[PDB]
Subunit: 495 residues, 3 copies
């Protein structure tokens, strides 16, 4: 009786008819349909957002997403340790909530539990039931975590958590969140995050990347659609002054973007980008930017060489550095913006070919693994599958040589940023002019933007070695110029 439904749901008919999902009865994914027919539109069907329904017919994708693996080096790797990805984090991000805890990423199945449990999220309120011995448990959020309650305190935590955070950890609010988190849905940007978390039972849904109605490759992330719509000819995913995205707006309430061809650069860019999803400060007037402002659910889709101008253009910065008071941008995991225009991107390779390589399940049916892969741990399938002349050692050597050269420049950029910050403090105590301190703040802004992008980004340059070198040497140059003018100004005081 789908034609009954299709009478008032025309877009679903468009997606589903003559699709690979054509035959699937509406009842497979929607409950209370009879009540919706019999009692009218006031009584909504139930749409349970649930990987297990997709798994009933796609077991290898479902099984590989939920498969539990144990990295013998462990997880919860703080980045701000000496041998870590961001060893000078505590000094360079002084005054930012990331100083409370920032760990390396792990598997997709953990993404909700790790967002809720991190020391920077909600003052330690959410914890693993049974603690560390259950840290590898997957499945339903509230089977895994407990709520210690609103009045509990945990020392050296922060309260960075907000509803927009959840948009990059789950598909559970797809029908309960108006476009951009503007008011009108069950939840919006101004919601109490502790109401929102109760609604999040699952990590990123199968529906995040795949239309349930027709199985079309798609995106559902509001900020990513908004970015592509703002710059449809020149954005990082465009080709020929066009992007492969048809936006479907349901009821003026929620958008999807459907693509004719798989583009995992867009599918993964739903989360693996720089974003603003937090309050901040305007550069002009020093006024707060609150969750009322659309800038608190924002995808720039700009790379390291563009972001400082981009955030100046939209009159926004994240935090003042606790020492220099520089109006700093906080960068997060810009993998899509890094990958854009790199050797592999230009070759037509997409994120999924390295990170979701082909494996065989079960009997021996071929599928894309949905347990996303760390290519250095799987070079036969992530690399040699395409680079057939490569030995495993050659693949590892190529990854690690690029990471080696890039990290050399990252560490040198940190040395110089640390020097800039320490010299600034000395310049302050030597009563150097606030005019000249302001010049140094600008150099800190620039050096910071060209450095922090790369500790935030997860490849240590592999995704774009040229951009990483140009950015990080630009950071070093800016810091050296700041240190020179501060040390010059310090001579001129006592001259």
């Amino acid at each position: 009786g789908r034609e009954t439904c299709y009478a008032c749901h025309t877009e679903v008919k468009s997606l589903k008819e003559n699709s690979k999902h054509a035959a699937i009865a509406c009842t497979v994914c929607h409950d209370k349909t009879k009540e919706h027919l019999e009692k009218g539109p006031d009584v909504k069907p139930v749409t349970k957002i649930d990987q297990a329904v997709c798994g009933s017919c796609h077991k290898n994708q479902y099984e590989s997403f939920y498969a539990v693996h144990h990295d013998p080096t462990g997880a919860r790797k703080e980045k701000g340790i000496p041998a870590g990805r961001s060893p000078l984090q505590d000094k360079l991000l002084a005054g930012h909530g990331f100083t409370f805890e920032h760990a390396e990423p792990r598997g997709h199945a953990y993404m909700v539990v790790d967002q809720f449990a991190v020391d920077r999220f909600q003052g330690g309120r959410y914890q693993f039931k049974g603690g560390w011995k259950n840290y590898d448990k997957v499945g339903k959020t509230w089977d895994i975590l407990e709520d210690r309650g609103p009045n509990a305190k945990l020392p050296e935590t922060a309260m960075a958590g907000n509803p927009t955070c959840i948009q990059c950890k789950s598909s559970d609010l797809i029908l309960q969140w108006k476009h951009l988190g503007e008011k009108g849905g069950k939840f919006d940007r101004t919601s109490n995050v502790n109401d929102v978390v109760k609604a999040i039972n699952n990590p990123v849904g199968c529906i995040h990347c795949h239309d349930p109605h027709g199985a079309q490759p798609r995106i559902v992330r509001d900020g990513l659609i908004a970015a592509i719509e703002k710059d449809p000819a020149k954005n990082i995913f465009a080709k020929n002054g066009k992007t492969d995205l048809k936006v479907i707006d349901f009821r003026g309430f929620r958008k999807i973007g459907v693509m004719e061809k798989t583009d995992s650069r867009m599918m993964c860019a739903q989360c693996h980008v720089e974003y603003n999803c937090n309050p901040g400060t305007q550069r002009t007037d020093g006024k707060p930017v609150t969750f009322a402002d659309a800038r608190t659910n924002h995808f720039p889709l700009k790379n390291s060489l563009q972001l400082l101008e981009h955030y100046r253009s939209i009159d926004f910065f994240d935090f003042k550095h606790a020492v220099t008071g520089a109006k700093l941008i906080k960068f997060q995991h810009p993998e899509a913006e890094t990958y854009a225009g790199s050797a592999h991107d230009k070759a037509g390779v997409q994120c999924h070919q390295c990170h979701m390589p082909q494996v065989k399940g079960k009997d021996g049916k071929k599928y894309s693994t949905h347990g996303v892969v760390k290519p250095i741990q799987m070079v036969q399938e992530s690399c040699i599958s395409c680079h057939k002349d490569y030995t495993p050692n050659k693949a590892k050597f190529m990854i690690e040589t690029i990471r080696n050269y890039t990290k050399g420049k990252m560490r040198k950029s940190e040395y110089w940023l640390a020097q800039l910050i320490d010299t600034f403090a000395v310049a302050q105590r030597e009563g150097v002019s606030p005019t000249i301190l302001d010049q140094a703040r600008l150099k800190h802004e620039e050096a910071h933007a060209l450095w922090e992008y790369w500790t935030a980004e997860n490849s240590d340059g592999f995704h774009n070695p040229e951009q990483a070198r140009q950015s990080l040497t630009g950071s070093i140059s800016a810091s050296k110029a700041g240190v020179k003018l501060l040390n010059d100004a310090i001579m001129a005081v006592k001259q």
Copy 2:
């Protein structure tokens, strides 16, 4: 003729009769017995303290203790290197002898040679015969080391060595050391350490943990007995307002503690504790505390959250920090005090189940390995033996995740301690009030106590992850409070 002996040695009769050692002739372990009978009590039998006698009937325990293994990452691992367990050691312990050399522990068979050869012991006087190529040799101290003599100098060494040090490296002085090292035995706390070392041929004896007379599980360490006796109802080993320890006092000269049931927490706490075994300074008057003082052979049996109050209560600190002049506690390897009240302790698991797992020897007789094990190197026997559902990768993941999270907080506590020390120095040079510097010293004391415990402790939180988090975040909080008040006081000067 044991009844002859038993006439004047009543306690030995109590331990030996109806024991597992009942049948063993006194002559097996004591020489010159006839002269002792014939010439009377003036001529003492010879009691050679020697693992090889125990080995004659317990070959697998003896063989596994002396087995030579080569860790391919080497030994003599200085902790104060960037990638090391205590990377900011040289700054945070400035003014302490540990800045001359402090390496990670290795195997028990090396414990005397490594105490005598470390650069902080006795000005480099003791060295390996033939140098590095013999660094893996086990057996008799003076087959392995040479004495360069009292007048030899070795640059960048220290003279921390003292007789009480030897009490945690050998059973060789069991009959030659009056309780607590008070005067009356061949050696006491005031002895020249260079006389004492000549008497130490073996590492920790079989008799350290096992009664030779009846084979009862026991302790012989004077400071550990003294601690248990001071607090017999509430100490970390107690249960039901009682400790499983019967103290036997021989001649008012030397004590053992015998337990009805194996408690390796007590057996290992003979050495794996925080201790004071060194001169120090009183907090009240600034007067020396010398080896005449019982506080120089002292076991607090207190954890990270208790030690600062404990050392304030007994009016003792180890060193003034070379920069801040904070009256600091020097912490050493508090494994027993950490382990106390942890998940595994509460489950009735003891040190030996993870560190002396069951292995098969020879033919295939089952025994507890007496080559103590680093569980991460042996997860099948140290972990999976009990956690039967664990894979080796799961065991490794669980150890390393806890170490990862704990080290993140350890490194952050060091960052903030370094900031506190650097800010203090700036506050001094900005002529901030000595009143306010004194407030900052108190914050350094607190931050130091809540940090250094964990670099001194060897598990990086595994033994008590909750206590480690509470302590290390407390350290960070104290340092941040010190940095705030110093930076506030620095504004107020030039206000």
Copy 3:
């Protein structure tokens, strides 16, 4: 017709007749011989310097030199990273070109391409054709690199490259370089390095260590011959007041040194030494030392305990430290001077026994591998071949224990150098006397000389553990003495 040639080339006759190469026709290695005979000496034969000619009869040496191996940890390892061999490089070498890039060494076949491509060589002018994916290519320089041209800029590079650099990367200029690079050959010390690089097609030739005429073990490096000639009785290679080197001077233009017996300490010392091959400054007058000066192609052949006196004696230093203005020596890879007088040197072991171990080729003919080996990666052939009682773990344990103890002192020397530099800067800002700052500069000179030798040297003490300890503790002592007098002078100012 060799007797025709031998008439005017008497030294070649001496080397070639009754040699292992006796039978080889001159035409095998020299072209245009008929024109040289027919047209006279004005028309020089062509002498193509080329491993492939040697390879025609020595395939296993040729094949093993050019064999491509992929270290899975990658290459281009910057030393100035936290976990790196020289973690405080950027601070301690501040004002030296090594701060732009200094990576660990890799295989011999890469030595030209890596010299030309390093960020410190020639402003990034030379790059790998096709970039990173060709970083493992071996063979001809200009098949592997491209020239971006003289006007191209690459941010955060330096221009350290000069002709004398090439003398330790290739045998290609053996007939085109007058002794010491004095004027008269196609190239000299004053040549434009960008003319010189065009002439360098190959890495170190077979002829670097082996005479082509008679196959005698030899050296061709001008600076090494000059050093041995200056001190023929007491130099590090001497025995019995004599060195095994007969110098043959061709035309007063170019020297070789031929040895009766293989001495790989000399063969490898052609490059694995400290050297001066750069402009610098005189200590006395502050005058430049230019490529006109013989001190710009100089081998001291002195160890860590001798170099500071050595460079003071010849009135030379490399750079003023950017903070302290200390007149610092820049140290490079002093492996031969370190190895001299070590346990293995005294035992008659040479570099080649550990680094060119015996392997079997082809069928199974035994040869010395000419792919030089990192012994920790090959302990069966580099170590156990001679230490037959060693297990692989024992060999690794011995290497890594020595490296562990040595690195502990290296890291501690860096901590104290960093403290010296930071204290100096504070002493300057507290207006401490320039007299007392000059005293501290001397302590920085000394501490620097006794430290940087060991980050420059590649064994982390393995080659001479006693010398490393004596040097690095001497560094620590010098820095502590500098920090004491600066901190004392700072009290005395405000006294």
